Write a protein that binds this ligand. Sequence first.
Ligand SMILES: [Zn+2]
Ligand SMILES: [Zn+2]
Lengths: 55, 55
Amino acid sequence: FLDGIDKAQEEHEKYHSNWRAMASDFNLPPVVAKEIVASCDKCQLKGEAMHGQVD
Amino acid sequence: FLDGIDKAQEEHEKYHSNWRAMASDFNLPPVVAKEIVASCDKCQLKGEAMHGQVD
Ligand SMILES: [Zn+2]
Ligand SMILES: [Zn+2]
């Protein structure tokens, strides 16, 4: 679990690749690749959330 | 990977337990338990984000 992710985590930092790319790069299920995105605040929170246009 | 999560995912829905509880319940590493939280929008986005107090 942590072994493949350690090498995969570095790849994420280098390009912030999507979980689909990391999954194929290490042939790991989306759960492992998706979790790396969950730890990456930049790829996880993509704006949206709120910040409406104010009333 | 998906087998334990399937049973663990149901437990998450029942109580929205934190990844620490699910990890101990199925004795799985934080990566597997943390990913379930990543899929749960209610436990993932806990307000914050933005929504400042306006100027
Ligand atoms: Zn990223
Ligand atoms: Zn939840």
